[PDB]
Amino acid sequence: NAPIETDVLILGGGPVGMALALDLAHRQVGHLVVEQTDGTITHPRVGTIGPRSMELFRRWGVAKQIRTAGWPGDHPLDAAWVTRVGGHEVYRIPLGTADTRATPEHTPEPDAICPQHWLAPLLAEAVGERLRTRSRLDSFEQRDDHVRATITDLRTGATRAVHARYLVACDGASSPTRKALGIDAPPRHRTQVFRNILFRAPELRSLLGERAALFFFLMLSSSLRFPLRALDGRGLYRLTVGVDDASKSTMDSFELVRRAVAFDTEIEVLSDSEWHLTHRVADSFSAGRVFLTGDAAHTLSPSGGFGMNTGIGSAADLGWKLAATLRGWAGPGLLATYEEERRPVAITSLEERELPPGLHDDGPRGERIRAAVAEKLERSGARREFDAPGIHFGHTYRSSIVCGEWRPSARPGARAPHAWLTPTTSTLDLFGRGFVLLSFGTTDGVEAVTRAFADRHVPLETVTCHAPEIHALYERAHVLVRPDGHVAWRGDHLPAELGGLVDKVRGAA
Numbered sequence: 001n002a003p004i005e006t007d008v009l010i011l012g013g014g015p016v017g018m019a020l021a022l023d024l025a026h027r028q029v030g031h032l033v034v035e036q037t038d039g040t041i042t043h044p045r046v047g048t049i050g051p052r053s054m055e056l057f058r059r060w061g062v063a064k065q066i067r068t069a070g071w072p073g074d075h076p077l078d079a080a081w082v083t084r085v086g087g088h089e090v091y092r093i094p095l096g097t098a099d100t101r102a103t104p105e106h107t108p109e110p111d112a113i114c115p116q117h118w119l120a121p122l123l124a125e126a127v128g129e130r131l132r133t134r135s136r137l138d139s140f141e142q143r144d145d146h147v148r149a150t151i152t153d154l155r156t157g158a159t160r161a162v163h164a165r166y167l168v169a170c171d172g173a174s175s176p177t178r179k180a181l182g183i184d185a186p187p188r189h190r191t192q193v194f195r196n197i198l199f200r201a202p203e204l205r206s207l208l209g210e211r212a213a214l215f216f217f218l219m220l221s222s223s224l225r226f227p228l229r230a231l232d233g234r235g236l237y238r239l240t241v242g243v244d245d246a247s248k249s250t251m252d253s254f255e256l257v258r259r260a261v262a263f264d265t266e267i268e269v270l271s272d273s274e275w276h277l278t279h280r281v282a283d284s285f286s287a288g289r290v291f292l293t294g295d296a297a298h299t300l301s302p303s304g305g306f307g308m309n310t311g312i313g314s315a316a317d318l319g320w321k322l323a324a325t326l327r328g329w330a331g332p333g334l335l336a337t338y339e340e341e342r343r344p345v346a347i348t349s350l351e352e353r354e355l356p357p358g359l360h361d362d363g364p365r366g367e368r369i370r371a372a373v374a375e376k377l378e379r380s381g382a383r384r385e386f387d388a389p390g391i392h393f394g395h396t397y398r399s400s401i402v403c404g405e406w407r408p409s410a411r412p413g414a415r416a417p418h419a420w421l422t423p424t425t426s427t428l429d430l431f432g433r434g435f436v437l438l439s440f441g442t443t444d445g446v447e448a449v450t451r452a453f454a455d456r457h458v459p460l461e462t463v464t465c466h467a468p469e470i471h472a473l474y475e476r477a478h479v480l481v482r483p484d485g486h487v488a489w490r491g492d493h494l495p496a497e498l499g500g501l502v503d504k505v506r507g508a509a
């Protein structure tokens with residue numbers, strides 16, 4: 001069989017690889033995803049989806065299916081520090097429910113909960129035929145204008161040759177592609193080992209009632225503290241305990257869960273495995289026509305789903321730069337800006353106690369003791385870890401393709417702010433294709449910008465907005481937004497040399 005040709009070969013069908021596939025599909029770029037496994041999920045590793053990631057899934061047309069995948073609209077989203085699930089509570093941060101939560105002001109897409117066993121199937125359905133499961137990329141050989149990859153269909157043992165213009169490795173933290181390329185990714189922190197116990201407790205939610213929660217942090221003893229999370233809000237829970245220097249023995253999985261649950265109820269352990277997390281960032285995000293994205297480029301903190309959200313955001317960044325180069329309007333230096341703009345996000349993120357006696361006491365004394373701990377927890381800004389839009393929306397690119405000059409801002413490099421145009425359409429819904437020039441009030445000079453972009457064959461759409469509130473939000477009369485939704489330039493007056501502007505934002509300067 002002759003070699004199969006495609007513009008982009010995506011190695012790895014994990015969350016990031018599928019996000020990239022969705023962005024390329026959205027941009028009408030030919031691609032193929034090879035996944036060595038069968039796509040099945042036996043122990044969900046991800047579930048929390050940040051609001052920015054959802055804005056991206058919105059753009060890619062799957063936000064609806066994600067939000068309706070099964071998480072209960074009436075399940076509490078609270079985070080609670082307790083001596084035992086169903087026992088004395090120390091500190092609880094009320095976060096409402098999916099159905100009662102107040103509409104977010106800075107985004108059309110609040111965060112979502114979609115465990116991997118629901119997420120994988122949905123993404124695979126959206127990507128369709130382009131996803132090849134049970135397919136293993138064995139090796140790749142770069143050529144001058146393309147990359148040759150050898151893939152083994154694990155069902156037939158037959159090997160196929162795939163010639164792609166670009167190979168994007170979304171093959172995870174231990175990325176064999178990164179190693180093959182000779183790119184180093186030195187550890188940025190000691191390795192953290194986590195023991196994950198996935199269990200099913202059918203009646204636990206009923207026993208908890210409104211005292212149920214998404215996140216439970218157990219304070220069983222000074223030597224035993226760990227999170228226990230509602231995974232699907234329908235019976236599945238995941239206890240994650242650290243196996244550190246304090247870990248002396250390996251307690252029985254069932255006994256650990258029973259110890260963490262105050263109720264005498266049905267508990268069935270489904271899986272008991274470990275995760276060795278080593279924060280690493282690739283020294284380089286590409287070599288020739290081979291790129292690294294997701295954990296392969298940056299294995300980061302899973303706190304608040306930061307690592308996965310960053311991976312999805314990096315996939316969206318590379319997606320538009322690849323499409324622009326493939327279509328021919330990108331400057332030769334555009335692809336290099338993927339590392340320039342995304343590597344700093346990863347780097348910056350990495351740069352970033354005992355229990356009082358009687359804490360589990362029933363009397364009014366223990367209640368007072370728990371109260372005290374609650375104060376320390378709150379003052380330590382523990383509640384800010386559940387209300388920090390800046391972490392999700394605040395990164396601002398200061399790069400070679402951005403013309404320089406938490407609260408939403410349209411400053412160059414930042415994510416253009418959300419505002420409703422209609423009850424169903426946000427300013428964000430205007431972004432994601434090509435460049436967009438938003439003009440508030442006057443349109444003088446806009447025709448000139450239009451021609452400047454056409455001369456370079458750079459896609460541009462111009463939109464005239466008459467809403468004074470949105471103008472106030474954006475602060476300037478004209479705002480040029482990039483294909484990724486970030487601002488490239490703004491001002492009350494269009495620049496004199498538009499040729500220079502067009503070349504700068506497309507990576508040609």
Ligand SMILES: Cc1cc2nc3c(=O)[nH]c(=O)nc-3n(C[C@H](O)[C@H](O)[C@H](O)COP(=O)(O)OP(=O)(O)OC[C@H]3O[C@@H](n4cnc5c(N)ncnc54)[C@H](O)[C@@H]3O)c2cc1C
Nearest residue numbers: 012013014015016035036045136137171172275294295302
């Ligand atoms: C045991 C374990 C437990 C984890 N627990 C958590 C957790 O509790 N919380 C959290 O936030 N994160 C957790 N993670 C990490 C989380 O899964 C990732 O951060 C996340 O999905 C990032 O995704 P990624 O898309 O970059 O890569 P991955 O999701 O790692 O996917 C890489 C994909 O590459 C494929 N692949 C690799 N080599 C080849 C090849 N040669 N040919 C074809 N396909 C190939 C794999 O089969 C896989 O599907 C865990 C990871 C592991 C391994």
Ligand SMILES: [Cl-]
Nearest residue numbers: 145165325326
């Ligand atoms: Cl090309």
